[PDB]
Design a protein around this ligand. Sequence first.
Ligand SMILES: CCCCCC(=O)O
Ligand SMILES: [Fe+3]
Ligand SMILES: [Fe+3]
Length: 221
Amino acid sequence: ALPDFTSDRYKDAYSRINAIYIEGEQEAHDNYIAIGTLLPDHVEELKRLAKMEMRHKKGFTACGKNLGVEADMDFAREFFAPLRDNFQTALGQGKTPTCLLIQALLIEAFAISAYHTYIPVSDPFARKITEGVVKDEYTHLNYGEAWLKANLESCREELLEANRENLPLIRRMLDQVAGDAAVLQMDKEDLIEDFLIAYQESLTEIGFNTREITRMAAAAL
Ligand SMILES: CCCCCC(=O)O
Ligand SMILES: [Fe+3]
Ligand SMILES: [Fe+3]
């Protein structure tokens, strides 16, 4: 059954999960702009992507206002700190393939999983907003997949390294959100399945074979 969106129990968990949505959209915006410093000829497309992320952020901000819940932004910022630190490191070293794997692949897949899972248990206001959002993040996966597919032969090793370092962070993120997510009536196994399916499909599209992908997914352990 649907959660009681008015309960103190729900609002408490929501303050953190919703803050994660909001912060995630903000960092996605920042990341796409940042990638523009690495792909100067991609700037106008990246600006469109980043603007979409700000629309997403505004929508989740609105979802919070609607339930009367103050977002715990401090919690969210710490939650994203490991991937954010790794993204910045890559950015400073000009490592475009690592930046794309972290943002366009890992974070977008995490988003699509969270949002797909949240929809059937969301309040009616948030549901319409979130239904809009999910259609968009496939556009973002497509963007990352396209560039990486086009450049695979020069960046294969970097990508294996990027996955090795960053996929475990996604696993720890899922472990950390699981409790609050369950209060929101979201099953951890659904979140994991949806995430892994999205990621595997991106890797397939990029040109990795089944063995390579199996070895990659394994690094989560
Ligand atoms: C769960 C928050 C992640 C959203 C990141 C994005 O919109 O690309
Ligand atoms: Fe988004
Ligand atoms: Fe996105």
